[PDB]
Design a protein around this ligand. Sequence first.
Ligand SMILES: Nc1ncnc2c1ncn2[C@@H]1O[C@H](COP(=O)(O)OP(=O)(O)OP(=O)(O)O)[C@@H](O)[C@H]1O
Ligand SMILES: Nc1ncnc2c1ncn2[C@@H]1O[C@H](COP(=O)(O)OP(=O)(O)OP(=O)(O)O)[C@@H](O)[C@H]1O
Ligand SMILES: Nc1ncnc2c1ncn2[C@@H]1O[C@H](COP(=O)(O)OP(=O)(O)OP(=O)(O)O)[C@@H](O)[C@H]1O
Ligand SMILES: [Mg+2]
Ligand SMILES: [Mg+2]
Ligand SMILES: [Mg+2]
Lengths: 515, 1030, 79
Amino acid sequence: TILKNGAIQLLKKVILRSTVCKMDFPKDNLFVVYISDGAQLPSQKGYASIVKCSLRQSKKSDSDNKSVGIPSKKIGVFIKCDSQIPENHIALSSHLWDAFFTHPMNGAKIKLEFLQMNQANIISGRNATVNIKYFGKDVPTKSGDQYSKLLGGSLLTNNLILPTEQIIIEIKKGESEQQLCNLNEISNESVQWKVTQMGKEEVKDIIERHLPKHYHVKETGEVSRTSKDEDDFITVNSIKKEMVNYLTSPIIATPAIILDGKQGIGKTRLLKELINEVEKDHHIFVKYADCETLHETSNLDKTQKLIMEWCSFCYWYGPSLIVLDNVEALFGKPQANDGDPSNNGQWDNASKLLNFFINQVTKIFNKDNKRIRVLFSGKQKTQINPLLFDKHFVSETWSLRAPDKHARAKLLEYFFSKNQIMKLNRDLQFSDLSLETEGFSPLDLEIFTEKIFYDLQLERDCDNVVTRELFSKSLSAFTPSALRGVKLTKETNIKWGDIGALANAKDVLLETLEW
Amino acid sequence: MKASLTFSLSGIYAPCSISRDIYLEYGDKKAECLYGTIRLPQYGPGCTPGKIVHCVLDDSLPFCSIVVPSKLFGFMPTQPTMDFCYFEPILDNVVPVLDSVTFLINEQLYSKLMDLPQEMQQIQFLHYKYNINSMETVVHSRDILTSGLCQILNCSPFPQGLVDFTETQLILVNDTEQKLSALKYANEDEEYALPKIGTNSALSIDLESLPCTISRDLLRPAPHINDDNSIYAFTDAETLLRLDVTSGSFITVSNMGCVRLVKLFVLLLPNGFKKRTIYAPPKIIASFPDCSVVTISKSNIGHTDIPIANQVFISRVGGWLQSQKCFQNIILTTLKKFFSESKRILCQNDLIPIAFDSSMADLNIAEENDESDDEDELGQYYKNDSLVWFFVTSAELDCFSKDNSHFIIDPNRTKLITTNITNRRPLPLSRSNLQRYYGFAETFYYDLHIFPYVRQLVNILETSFNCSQRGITLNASVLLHSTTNNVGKATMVRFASKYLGIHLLEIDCLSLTSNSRQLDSTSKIIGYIRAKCENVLPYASPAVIFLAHLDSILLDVNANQDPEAIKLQKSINFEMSKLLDDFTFKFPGTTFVGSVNNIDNVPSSFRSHMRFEILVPVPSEAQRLRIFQWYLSSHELNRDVQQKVPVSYMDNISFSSLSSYSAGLTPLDIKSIVETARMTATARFYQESKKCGWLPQSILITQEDLSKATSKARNEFSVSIGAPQIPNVTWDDIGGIDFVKGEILDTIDMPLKHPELFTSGMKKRSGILFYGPPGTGKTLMAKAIATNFSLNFFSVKGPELLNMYIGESEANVRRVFQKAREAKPCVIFFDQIDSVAPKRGNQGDSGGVMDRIVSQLLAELDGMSTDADGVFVIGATNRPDLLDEALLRPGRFDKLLYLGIPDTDTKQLNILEALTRKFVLDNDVKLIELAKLCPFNYTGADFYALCSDAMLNAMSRIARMVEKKVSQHNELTGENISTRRWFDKIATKEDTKVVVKMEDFLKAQEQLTPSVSRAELNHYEAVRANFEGA
Amino acid sequence: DVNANQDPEAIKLQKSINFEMSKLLDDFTFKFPGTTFVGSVNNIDNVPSSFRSHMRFEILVPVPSEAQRLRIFQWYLSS
Ligand SMILES: Nc1ncnc2c1ncn2[C@@H]1O[C@H](COP(=O)(O)OP(=O)(O)OP(=O)(O)O)[C@@H](O)[C@H]1O
Ligand SMILES: Nc1ncnc2c1ncn2[C@@H]1O[C@H](COP(=O)(O)OP(=O)(O)OP(=O)(O)O)[C@@H](O)[C@H]1O
Ligand SMILES: Nc1ncnc2c1ncn2[C@@H]1O[C@H](COP(=O)(O)OP(=O)(O)OP(=O)(O)O)[C@@H](O)[C@H]1O
Ligand SMILES: [Mg+2]
Ligand SMILES: [Mg+2]
Ligand SMILES: [Mg+2]
């Protein structure tokens, strides 16, 4: 088939899946897309688009008419071959995402088309022209030459929005195909650029299109957001390695994994880094729930819709993963009993959801092993509803035991660095500094460090971070989370000494309590 | 790589000619003998495992073509052969060498082999006989060297590899049973030019479902762009010759007034389908209540079919899915997609199958587009999970009304028009396995000859089916109940449905409201049920309404309840009862198939109507064998994974032992085992692939893995019942307790090992208790049994049972025994029985609950109706006299074992060695004087204190030594580190290894007291005298 | 605090606020600088763990001693 322009020809349609493996290249290009090594590329250039996801549109599209129906948009793209990315996946560089007005999520279907053509490759075949018009609230006017250097330096197609700087690319030269046009193969003397501001009426008319404002939540820029309170993670324990090795295996036993823990011992941050890792080098889509934020859990019919929606999305996308922090809120057996029929104790209001979820998941897992998998976490293994172990949903388990001596050093080092002002004296060292901190955990440690920062800042009458001989005193005033909740006592002030003839006993005590 | 294929009658080990292009551009030029691997693509759910071959250059072969001996696959190229395969030349020409190969030989050749004089001479004779060479010839498995003479019985290291014919062991086995006579190289069952002369009119032949889908690439001919796969039929070549046309244009199938037009292709040779039969897909078969035999005829006028496609009339068949709100949209879309094809043909009374994905009900992929909108490749990601039909009635005739038998539908002229819901019977499982064809999640294929209970259900349903022409309202409700979850009730129901071809309604507990039911919950339930049913029953004949987990909805009256809350329960009960019988006489053939996990709680008002109640036992030894045979089957493992390397089990597995070793496990547990085995095998395969060693082309499950996967499954179960994590004591620590050791062995294990002599209902004396002075192993023996015997170990933490209220102790005891009884091979450890079972009815006691509880013990422990005696009971006390006699009887506690103080230097040395076992002892001195110097009033526990004290002293010595070393270092430096810092900055592992020298023992022994006085010991001695002296 | 002898619905709706109060403290601490959450209680033992641990500083306010009540008197009798 030959395109509307007689010099351009169509070859074949193909479908692939997106990835965020961060393939990079210089500024000259904006629409580079990386195909995998394998079947040779029938053409160097092409067209691309994404098949938009949508709900069932039930209840008249959730009471929204959606009268402005649009068939998305068609884009042109460079395509290049790479060896790292798997066969079925497609790499979509940082640009051209904002064109689709969709966040660069891991998995999404790409329609890809290979384009052939004869004439327009010739250098300076005809003069090129285009207008880079400001769409929304805009930076003051700038030269079109630097815009061309920055925008579509090698290739572009009309009707492309860009919310990254609120601009529109347009041209109506006349008798023009309104299709793909190459730029870097054309000399500067055979191309023209101009800039204007778009009319308010046309701006609001275009705003009617499907343009989800990505920065509706306040941000300082595309490269900086205040949400990043913590932007590092310390490889204290092997478990992150384990889960990465097992969860991503080509074949798995049972859909589910369970991640137990203890009060603040690591769970949420560990899962958030597991997301941040697994999303990159293994092309796994992830849906994060945090069931606590989920409202109206006990409304079974309403919650069931979200339960179905989760797995529906997860199945539509590529090999995916489901993760629930603090599961016991949504699928937890109350376990409190005074009198109840055995069947209702087996099947109460909460478990119904669990059975539905299990059945729905198994419906997929039993016909596509690598498609969908779930990863629960909760305060305690056994505490969770027995259905999981009964129905054989969870197979392997892991526990975040409190970090060992060798590990705490790294954690304290990192938390000390985080405040960027605290530092030890030449005479003091980390590894010894930790040993007194027995029975702690990262919550304990982080609050203890803040406590040290306060006690050094005012209570020592010094500006610089004097950091010895107050450590013990501060610790004395501290109470680890575990101890904090039960009836310990330190009331006795009588010193280590004050011994008498009780030496013959104190020896023994040393030999059985301290040694 | 894809290579053109042809066959020859050469030898099995003859080199395989390969084209010059492949031999040069991909074949290794440095290899003296080039080896490759070939995969034969065949009509099935997956490609065959690769077979290795040796190849050589051949200039006569055209572009990308190969020639191989047909005898490598047990046939000859008389019938049309396949035209291509997938091939790859091994990189680096890596191949493994088998250490041993097992061959099966005929009697005559074995006699010849003895007659042959010498081992080397026999080796050379075999070399000449079957072209087997050392380090040159490659062998395979399950192959035949020659028809009816020899066969490769087994190959241990790998399915295929080189043979070190100079050293590789050849396990030659004489065929004493003449099994080799069953071998058959695809030979003909004779052949006649004209078995019937001039039979051009018609031929009668069998019809059976095509076992799997068909891929166009495997087709010998070159059909057009469209309208092919809907009317395919396949047969043997000679059957085509009997029809006088080789793969003729069109055929017609006519019986019982139904005539259909079909297309017949040739069945390709390598497939192992049956002979002289029609193989067709479900599309055509569904049209008939087909007889096992069917007649076919030529139809040349089919080539001149007419496109009269105007205003066609379509109808949705009755069915569970068709009446669902959400599915209807995707059903419409997929039907329009199916009829979007240019040239599909159709005729009246035809059933057209329509597959679709169950979970895409909500994923509207995109709106209709002006151009470049198509589904073909977009669908490849998802595979279907549900299936429906559509029933076609009439069509326009136009000026071509002279004939209406068969016609085409054209999208340029056909429009979607539909009538109301029709009805028609499904397809019985016995005639066509639709799931198999469409790769669905196959319902387990029960075998009525073996499983008792399923036969009852199928018989009842088929009786209600056959009574249709008797025409009476004999239909009866059926209730399934089980002692435990996950026993396949819903599966067996689905089996019955598919077998008898009965539309199935699967209502379940995905209800709308169950908490605070006062909010009109009764309506929300019953109206939902009535609406769901009423949209299906008037169009299903017969029909089945299946209510899963009915137990948790029709709850019975509670003992303690709100007086008005229970009213809703009563109302729902009664209305359910009403709607139960309403369907009985509002429609013919309706059967109510309910399921319950405990029949005790079903309401008597509802249950009393019930007239058939089938208990579904956990599968016994016989069944588990079949279940394993199923889940391990090729058509199960290879499914649903899409791994690029097919899967299979190694033939060395053994159903018979596996079954017996998996006792008590439910089917779901079995599947869990299989899945875990699959995981471990895949992990092994990818680990080997990561390594530099030879890479198998298939991943093989191994019994050596199942042996431990079953153990892990059992440990999972043991965690389910909440048993404690007892420490890992070993059977060897127990020391000087040989007598009691053997006594315990004679009961815990003797009737458990070789379970045939004791296999009877006898009183197997499941009771035993230890009694005697403190600290002589009573708890340790239990701790050992807890892990060394694989019996579930329940701990009764002293007076754990006793409780606040009047009757909850009596509930706790019964709950403990009930839960233990759930897992038959279980142990009960009553630690310090004194606290729980004091002497009944003494004056010096108050409250009386201690009497009630001991009475309850006496009751439940022994009682009457007791069976499955595997529940052992092990008790311990310091002193038994506080126990009541009624416990000191056979059936409860037969022998009281007095684990007394050893009083014997042999035993003393034995216990001293057993205690010292696992830590190093310096051998410069002999330990026996430690026995000789202690008086016999010393006790097993105080010898433990002796050993630990001596150890602690000897290790305090090392502590002082390291203290001296660190002090010296601090003196050398600026005293800048303590001991703690020393232990992370510096390490002297070998220095810290404390080794005790018996001087330490001779120091310690002077300081430690006996654990009991003579006063107490004489007391326990007298106790023993009373109980044992007699 | 968590109630061991209360209906499950009440316990769940109480856990809801117990968690959300922590979440609210987090979000307010994040949103603006200087925001200082100063809560008060009359019996520490009743505060849930989910809040007892996360909180930084605990100050024990005692019954005034001799040196203090003198000042308190001198205050409340001032003109
Ligand atoms: N290994 C680690 N590396 C880096 N930061 C860590 C690590 N462990 C904990 N932290 C930090 O300490 C915080 C402690 O809270 P954490 O995420 O462990 O608890 P949580 O799982 O949300 O708790 P809860 O169990 O109460 O729901 C983390 O949010 C993170 O900021
Ligand atoms: N006897 C069996 N043979 C084969 N598969 C079985 C058997 N019993 C159960 N299954 C498996 O279990 C699933 C369906 O049966 P399932 O265990 O859900 O039965 P059920 O009667 O609904 O159980 P329950 O009411 O105890 O939950 C399928 O995955 C099926 O393969
Ligand atoms: N003969 C022995 N063999 C092995 N270990 C022994 C022996 N005698 C004593 N011990 C050790 O000393 C302790 C004695 O354990 P034992 O089983 O006698 O405890 P028990 O039943 O609680 O005793 P008690 O009679 O005081 O109630 C254990 O730590 C055990 O390891
Ligand atoms: Mg958390
Ligand atoms: Mg069930
Ligand atoms: Mg004891």
